[PDB]
Amino acid sequence: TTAAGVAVGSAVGHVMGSALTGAFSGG
Amino acid sequence: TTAAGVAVGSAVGHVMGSALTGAFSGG
Amino acid sequence: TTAAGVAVGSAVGHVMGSALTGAFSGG
Amino acid sequence: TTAAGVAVGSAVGHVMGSALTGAFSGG
Amino acid sequence: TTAAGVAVGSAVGHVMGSALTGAFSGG
Amino acid sequence: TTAAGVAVGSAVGHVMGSALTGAFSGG
Amino acid sequence: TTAAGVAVGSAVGHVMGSALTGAFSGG
Amino acid sequence: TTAAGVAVGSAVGHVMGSALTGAFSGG
Amino acid sequence: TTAAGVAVGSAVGHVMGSALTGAFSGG
Amino acid sequence: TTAAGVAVGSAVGHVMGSALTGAFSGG
Amino acid sequence: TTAAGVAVGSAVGHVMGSALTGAFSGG
Amino acid sequence: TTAAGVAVGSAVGHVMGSALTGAFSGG
Amino acid sequence: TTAAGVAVGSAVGHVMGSALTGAFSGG
Amino acid sequence: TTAAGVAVGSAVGHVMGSALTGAFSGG
Amino acid sequence: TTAAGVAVGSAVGHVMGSALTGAFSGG
Amino acid sequence: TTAAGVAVGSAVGHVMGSALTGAFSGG
Amino acid sequence: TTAAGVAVGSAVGHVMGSALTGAFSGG
Amino acid sequence: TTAAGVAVGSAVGHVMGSALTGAFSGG
Amino acid sequence: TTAAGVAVGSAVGHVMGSALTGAFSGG
Amino acid sequence: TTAAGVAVGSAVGHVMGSALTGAFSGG
Amino acid sequence: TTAAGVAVGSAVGHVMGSALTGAFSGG
Amino acid sequence: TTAAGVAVGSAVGHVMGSALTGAFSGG
Amino acid sequence: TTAAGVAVGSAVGHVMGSALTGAFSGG
Amino acid sequence: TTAAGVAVGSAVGHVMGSALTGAFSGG
Amino acid sequence: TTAAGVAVGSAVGHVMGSALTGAFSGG
Amino acid sequence: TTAAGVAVGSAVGHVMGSALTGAFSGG
Amino acid sequence: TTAAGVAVGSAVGHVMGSALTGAFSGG
Amino acid sequence: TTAAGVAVGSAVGHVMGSALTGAFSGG
Amino acid sequence: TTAAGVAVGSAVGHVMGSALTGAFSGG
Amino acid sequence: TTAAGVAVGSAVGHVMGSALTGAFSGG
Amino acid sequence: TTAAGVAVGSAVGHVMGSALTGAFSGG
Amino acid sequence: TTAAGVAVGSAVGHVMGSALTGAFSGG
Amino acid sequence: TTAAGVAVGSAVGHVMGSALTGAFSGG
Amino acid sequence: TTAAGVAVGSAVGHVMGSALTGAFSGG
Amino acid sequence: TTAAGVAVGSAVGHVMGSALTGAFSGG
Amino acid sequence: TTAAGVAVGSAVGHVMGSALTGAFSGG
């Protein structure tokens, strides 16, 4: 299984308690 | 299984308790 | 299993209690 | 299993209690 | 299992209690 | 198992109680 | 198991109670 | 098991109570 | 087991109570 | 004048001869 | 003058000769 | 004049002849 | 004039002849 | 004039003929 | 004029003919 | 004029004909 | 004029014909 | 004019025809 | 099967992601 | 099967990600 | 199977990630 | 199978990550 | 199988990560 | 299988990480 | 299998990490 | 198997980490 | 197996860490 | 005065007594 | 005065008594 | 006055009594 | 006056009584 | 006056009574 | 006046009565 | 006046009555 | 006046009545 | 006047009536 991604949060505000995963590939 | 994606949050406001995954590919 | 990703937080605000993973590949 | 990634936090604000992993590849 | 990554924190603010791992490859 | 990474902290602020590991490869 | 990495702290601020490991390879 | 790394602290600020290991290779 | 590393502290500030090991290779 | 933005390219394909500016604020 | 925006290209195809600006604020 | 931004290229493909500026603030 | 930004290239492909500037602030 | 930024290239591919500037602040 | 930045190249591939400047502050 | 930066090259590949400057501050 | 920086090359590959300057402060 | 820096080459590969200057302060 | 051809791209602009084949002769 | 051809790209602009084959003759 | 060809790139601009084959003759 | 060809890159710009083959003749 | 070719790169710019083969003749 | 070729790099710029083979003839 | 070739690098610039083989003839 | 070749490097610049083989003939 | 070759380095610059073999003939 | 052009002759037939100029710019 | 051009003759036939100039720039 | 060009003759046929100039720049 | 060029003759046929000049720059 | 060029003859046929000049720069 | 060039003859055929000059710089 | 060049003859055929000059610099 | 060059004859065939000068610098 | 050069004849065939001068510097 192949995964490809981009995860971008905010540009000015904060990031609190957040799961920013670019790509997930389970097995 | 192949996955491709882009996940973008806000540009000014915050991101709180959010799961921003670019791509998920389970097995 | 292959994973590729980019995870970017904020540009001005802080990052608090956040899991910024570029790519995850379980086994 | 292969993993590739980039994890970038903030540019101005702090990073507090955060797990910034560029790439994870379980076995 | 192969892992490759880059983990970058802040550029101005501090880094407190954070796990900045460039790449993790479990066995 | 092979691991490759880069871990960079802040450029102006301090680094306090932080685990900056360039690459981890368990056995 | 092979490990390769670079761990860089701050450029202006201090480093306090931090584990800066370039590469870890368990057995 | 092979390990290779570079660990660099600050350039202006101090280093206090910190474990700067270039490379660790357990057995 | 083979280990190779470089550990560099500060360039202006002091180094206090710090374990600067270039490379560790346990047996 | 204040500007805030996020510019994200592709997730799989390349980026060729492109001006990806997150935010522009002329004077 | 204030500007806020998000510009996202493709998710699979390439980006060629394109001006992806998140936000522009002239003076 | 204040500028804040994030510019992210591709996640798998290359970046060729591209001007990736996070934020521009002219004077 | 203040500028803040993040510029991230690819995660797998190369970067050729590209100007990756995190933030530009002219005078 | 103040500038703050982060510039990150690739994680697997090379970087050829590229100007990776974290922050530029002209006078 | 004040400048602060982080410039990181590749993690696996080479760096050829590239100008990696962490921060530039002209006068 | 003040400058602060971090410039990191590759972690596995070579560095050829490259200008890796942590911070530049002209006068 | 004040300059502060860190310049780190590769961790495994060579460094050929490269100008690795930690900080430059012209007059 | 004040300069402070750290310049570190490779950890395994050679250094050939390279100018590794920790800090330069012209007059 | 015989094939003869001439394929010419642009004279001023670039060529991006293009398959310029002078002649193709399948079997 | 016989093939004959000429493939010419640009005269001023670049060539990016392009397959310039003068002649192809499959079997 | 016989193949004959000429493949010419640019005259001023660069050539990035391009497959310039004068002639291909499969079997 | 016979192959004959000429592959010419640029005259002023660089050649990055390109496969310049004068002639290929598979078997 | 017979192969004949000429592969010429640039005349002013560099050649980076490129496979310049005059002629290839597989078996 | 017979191979004949000429591979010429640059005339002014450098050659970095490049495979310049005049002729290859596999068996 | 017979091979004949000429491989020429640069005339002014350097040659770094390059495999300049005049002719290769596998068995 | 017969091999014949000429491998010439630079005329002014250096040769670093390069494999200049005039002719290779495997068995 | 027969091999014949000429390997010539630079005429002005140095030769560092280079394998200059006139001809190699394995068995 | 600026000139840019491409001049291509035949692909199969000969070229006899012909002035093939890519670009002419008189003074 | 600036000139840029590409002049390509035939691919199969001969070139007899022909002036193939890539670019001419008189003074 | 500046000139840049590429002049390529035939790929199979001969070149007889021909003036193949890559670039001419009179004074 | 500046001149830059590439002049390439045939790939299979001969070159007889021909003036192959890469670049000419009169005074 | 500056001149830069590459002049390449044939790859299989002979060179008879030919003036192959890489670059000419009159005074 | 500066001159730089590369002149390469044939790879298989002979060179008879030919003036192969790499670079000429008159005075 | 400065001259730099490389002149290479054949790789298999002979060289008869030929003036192979690497660089000429008249006075 | 400065001259630098490399002159290489054949690799298999003879050299008869030939003037192989690496560099000439008249006065 | 300064001269530097390398003159190499054949590797297998003879050298008859030939003037092999590494460097000539007239007065």
From Swiss-Prot, chains A, B, C, D, E, F, G, H, I, J, K, L, M, N, O, P, Q, R, S, T, U, V, W, X, Y, Z, AA, AB, AC, AD, AE, AF, AG, AH, AI, AJ:
Subcellular location: Mitochondrion intermembrane space
Impact reported for residue 10 to L: In FTDALS2; results in disorganization of mitochondrial cristae
Tissue expression notes: Ubiquitously expressed. Higher expression is observed in heart and liver.
Disease linkage: Frontotemporal dementia and/or amyotrophic lateral sclerosis 2: A neurodegenerative disorder characterized by frontotemporal dementia and/or amyotrophic lateral sclerosis in affected individuals. There is high intrafamilial variation. Frontotemporal dementia is characterized by frontal and temporal lobe atrophy associated with neuronal loss, gliosis, and dementia. Patients exhibit progressive changes in social, behavioral, and/or language function. Spinal muscular atrophy, Jokela type: An autosomal dominant, slowly progressive, lower motor neuron disease. SMAJ is characterized by adult-onset of muscle cramps and fasciculations affecting the proximal and distal muscles of the upper and lower limbs. The disorder results in weakness and mild muscle atrophy later in life.
Protein purpose: May be involved in the maintenance of mitochondrial organization and mitochondrial cristae structure.
Record's protein name: Coiled-coil-helix-coiled-coil-helix domain-containing protein 10, mitochondrial
Gene that produces this protein: CHCHD10
Full-sequence range covered: 50 to 76 of 142
